[PDB]
Scaffold this active site. Structure first.
Site, PDB file in Angstrom:
ATOM      1  N   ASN B  78       0.798  -1.222   0.000  1.00  0.00           N
ATOM      2  CA  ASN B  78       0.000   0.000   0.000  1.00  0.00           C
ATOM      3  C   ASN B  78       0.833   1.276   0.000  1.00  0.00           C
ATOM      4  OD1 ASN B  78      -1.498  -2.027   2.260  1.00  0.00           O
ATOM      5  ND2 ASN B  78      -2.608  -1.593   0.365  1.00  0.00           N
ATOM      6  N   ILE B  85       0.980   6.979  -0.148  1.00  0.00           N
ATOM      7  CA  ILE B  85       0.338   6.056   0.770  1.00  0.00           C
ATOM      8  C   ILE B  85      -1.114   5.923   0.402  1.00  0.00           C
ATOM      9  CG2 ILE B  85      -0.281   5.597   3.203  1.00  0.00           C
ATOM     10  CD1 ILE B  85       2.064   7.489   3.978  1.00  0.00           C
ATOM     11  N   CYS B  86      -1.542   4.699   0.171  1.00  0.00           N
ATOM     12  CA  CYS B  86      -2.956   4.461  -0.067  1.00  0.00           C
ATOM     13  C   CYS B  86      -3.662   4.119   1.231  1.00  0.00           C
ATOM     14  CB  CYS B  86      -3.173   3.349  -1.087  1.00  0.00           C
ATOM     15  SG  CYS B  86      -4.884   2.758  -1.137  1.00  0.00           S
ATOM     16  N   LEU B  87      -4.351   5.110   1.772  1.00  0.00           N
ATOM     17  CA  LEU B  87      -5.022   4.983   3.048  1.00  0.00           C
ATOM     18  C   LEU B  87      -6.285   5.773   2.914  1.00  0.00           C
ATOM     19  CD1 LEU B  87      -4.756   4.048   6.009  1.00  0.00           C
ATOM     20  CD2 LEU B  87      -3.743   6.281   6.488  1.00  0.00           C
ATOM     21  N   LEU B 110      -1.254   0.481   9.191  1.00  0.00           N
ATOM     22  CA  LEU B 110      -1.076  -0.016   7.834  1.00  0.00           C
ATOM     23  C   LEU B 110       0.219  -0.799   7.691  1.00  0.00           C
ATOM     24  CD1 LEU B 110      -2.235  -0.033   4.999  1.00  0.00           C
ATOM     25  CD2 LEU B 110      -1.064   2.131   4.584  1.00  0.00           C
TER      26      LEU B 110
END
Lengths: 140, 149
Positions: B78, B85-87, B110
Site C-alpha cells: 500500500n 500512501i494508499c489509506l 497499515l
C-alpha cells in the site's frame, strides 16, 4: 500566504504531467520513477510549425534543486538545437537569456519553462536558424 | 496574523505529547510542514527500522486532508515507489473530526497490517498475495537496506 513545500509541489507537477495540458506540445515526467526526491525530470517540446524546429521532438533534462520552486530549475537540451540562450556545444540553457528563468517566480513550474522555450522557438531570431541534423544529442 | 488555533494546538500537542513510536520535527521554514520518523511496528518485517515521512497541512486544513508521503523506500503493498500512501482517511474518508495523531497511528497500523487485496501497487501486492512469505522477507530486506540509518 500558505506556501506548499517543494516535495508536495513536485507531486502536483507529477500528476499534471501525467494528465497532460493543452494541446500536448510540451510534456514532462520523472526521469527515474523511483526517485523519491523528485529532482530529475524529462521534458519534451514539439518544435513549432513554420520554424526550422518544425516536426522535431526535443528532449530536455530539467533539474529541480532543493530550493525549487523558490529558485528556478536548471535546464538542458539533450536533443541538439541551435537556439539563442542554449549553449550550442553542451545544450545547457543560460538562465540569463531566457526570461522565465532570468525573472523566475515561485508560481512558475516545469510546464511554464517548457512552454516558454517553445514560444521562444517562434522568435524572429530563432525560427530561421539552420539546425543540426535531426536526431543528434549532446554528451553527458 | 498567525495560524488557526487548531493548527497551533495540533502543532504543539506533538512536542508536549509525542505518539508512541513516532517523532516529529518542524520544518525550519514552513510552519505547516513536518518531518516525521515512524518506527517499524512491533512484530512487523519493518521492526527495528525507522521510516521518514513528510506531512503538510494545506490551506484548507482541516476541511482538506493533511498530505503525507514516505521518504524512505519501503516494500509494502500500500505504499508506492514514490512513497505515496494508499489509506482511506487520506482521501475520500477524511473528515475534519480526525486529527494528525490519528492519521499517524493509522499509517503505523497499515505497516502492521498490509493489505494486498486492495493494493496500490499491484507488483508488490501480487507478491504479497501469492508468495506472502517471500514478500515479508523482502520487506525485511528493504528495511535492512534503507531504514537502518
Amino acid at each position: 500566504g500558505v506556501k506548499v513545500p517543494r516535495n508536495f509541489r513536485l507531486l502536483e507537477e507529477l500528476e499534471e504531467g501525467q494528465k497532460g495540458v493543452g494541446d500536448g506540445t510540451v510534456s514532462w515526467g520523472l526521469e527515474d520513477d523511483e526517485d523519491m526526491t523528485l529532482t530529475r525530470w524529462t521534458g519534451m517540446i514539439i518544435g513549432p510549425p513554420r520554424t526550422n524546429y518544425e516536426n522535431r521532438i526535443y528532449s530536455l533534462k530539467v533539474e529541480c534543486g532543493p530550493k525549487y520552486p523558490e529558485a528556478p530549475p536548471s535546464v538542458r537540451f539533450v536533443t541538439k538545437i541551435n537556439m539563442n540562450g542554449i549553449n550550442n556545444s553542451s545544450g545547457m540553457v543560460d538562465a540569463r537569456s531566457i526570461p522565465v528563468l532570468a525573472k523566475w517566480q515561485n508560481s512558475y513550474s516545469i510546464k511554464v519553462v517548457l512552454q516558454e522555450l517553445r514560444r521562444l522557438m517562434m522568435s524572429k531570431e530563432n525560427m530561421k536558424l539552420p539546425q543540426p541534423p535531426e536526431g543528434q544529442t549532446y554528451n553527458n | 496574523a498567525g495560524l488557526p488555533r487548531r493548527i497551533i494546538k495540533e502543532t504543539q500537542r506533538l512536542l508536549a505529547e509525542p505518539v508512541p513510536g513516532i517523532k516529529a520535527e518542524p520544518d525550519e521554514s514552513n510552519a505547516r510542514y513536518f518531518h516525521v520518523v515512524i518506527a517499524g511496528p512491533q512484530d512487523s518485517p519493518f521492526e527495528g527500522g525507522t521510516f521518514k515521512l513528510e506531512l503538510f497541512l494545506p490551506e484548507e486544513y482541516p476541511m482538506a486532508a493533511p498530505k503525507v508521503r514516505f521518504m524512505t523506500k519501503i516494500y509494502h503493498p500500500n505504499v508506492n515507489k514514490l512513497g505515496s500512501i494508499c489509506l482511506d482517511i487520506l482521501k475520500d474518508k477524511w473528515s475534519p473530526a480526525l486529527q494528525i495523531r490519528t492519521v499517524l497511528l493509522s499509517i503505523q497500523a497499515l505497516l502492521s497490517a498490509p493489505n494486498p487485496d486492495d493494493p496500490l501497487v499491484p507488483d508488490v501486492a501480487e507478491q504479497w498475495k501469492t508468495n506472502e512469505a517471500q514478500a515479508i522477507e523482502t520487506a525485511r530486506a528493504w528495511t535492512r537496506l534503507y531504514a537502518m540509518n
